[PDB]
Design a protein around this ligand. Sequence first.
Ligand SMILES: O=C(O)c1sc(Cc2ccccc2)nc1-c1ccccc1
Length: 188
Amino acid sequence: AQYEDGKQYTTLEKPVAGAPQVLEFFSFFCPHCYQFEEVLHISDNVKKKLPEGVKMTKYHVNFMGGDLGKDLTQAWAVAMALGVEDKVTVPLFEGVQKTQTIRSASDIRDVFINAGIKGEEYDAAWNSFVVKSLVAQQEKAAADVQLRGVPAMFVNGKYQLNPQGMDTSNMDVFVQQYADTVKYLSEK
Ligand SMILES: O=C(O)c1sc(Cc2ccccc2)nc1-c1ccccc1
């Protein structure tokens, strides 16, 4: 077939019921995640190929970067709670990987302040149980799929994208193949 289990995607041996339709995992410490966001814009190109108002979810992971990696999962929970993902994603990537100016939870906070989130509002969210619950959702979802690597994408809790078997000589063709595969998987 043109799409083959084991090739463009793997199929979850233990499928995860009641999982989000399109679920991506990333870390601000992961270089390929950096590219998926700023160079390839995977998420928006997947979104443009899927039906209206499909639910796309994106979660940070703890298993890279030690203490600060776990701080970033809580900060991503803040970003989700406030709906400011689009304003902090690039400066967080650049602060961790480009300028290496993010060394502490305070440095993470400066990124939200600079992006226009009020200091009071960031701190209330950071300390909120709504955010603690978002942190728990992120960890649980990663545990449900025994995640050990990013970037990762899962469709309908049953199929995992496998980009390692895709031609990467042309960025635009790669993105299109990634997005068309997700669409194919969502339609199964
Ligand atoms: O496997 C690889 O080498 C590449 S390349 C890439 C972005 C890109 C595409 C085309 C040209 C330049 C960059 N992402 C990955 C990747 C690696 C491991 C897990 C998930 C994705």
